[PDB]
Amino acid sequence: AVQQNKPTRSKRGMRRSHDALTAVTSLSVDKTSGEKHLRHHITADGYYRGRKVIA
């Protein structure tokens, strides 16, 4: 169940090539409150599709 030789930094980098992240593409800038948020997510102030819903 345990390894036989020591694997190279070549093999370790090749395996880690896939675990790197992808960024969030582009934040939706809300039209009437000018601030950035994710797609379909309410902002920090509380706006979503214009209207303030929340306190």
Binding site: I42, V53, I54
Partner: protein, 119 residues
């Protein structure tokens, strides 16, 4: 496997899951908007909406039935007094799921669920 089934397990045995669903429904009826995770609120939709549909016709049998569903006289009286006539003319769909980011301690994708006649 999960072919044509419905109802999220939510990492809980069934007694605990039913008890926390009626507890979250009581908390929603009291505080009028709650903030929870996303699949918990997505399962709360199909639980807190039958209560308002049941209390959209007020009677003694339906009032004892909502007492069976929610186990609390405050939730029952608040339902059949104020959440009856407010959603009288509303053909279902009394909740409004709003996604709001993530939780800082376990990265759970949060959600703000309210009633539509809130403000």
């Amino acid at each position: 496997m999960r072919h044509r089934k419905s109802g999220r397990q939510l990492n809980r045995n069934s007694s605990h899951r039913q008890a926390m669903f009626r507890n979250m429904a009581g908390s929603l009826v009291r505080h009028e908007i709650i903030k929870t995770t996303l699949p918990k609120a997505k399962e709360l939709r199909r639980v807190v909406e039958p209560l308002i549909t049941l209390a959209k016709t007020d009677s003694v049998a339906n009032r004892r039935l909502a007492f069976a569903r929610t186990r609390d006289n405050e939730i029952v009286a608040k339902l059949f007094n104020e959440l009856g006539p407010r959603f009288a003319s509303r053909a279902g769909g009394y909740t409004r799921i709003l996604k709001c980011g993530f939780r800082a301690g376990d990265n759970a994708p949060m959600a703000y669920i309210e009633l539509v006649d809130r403000s």
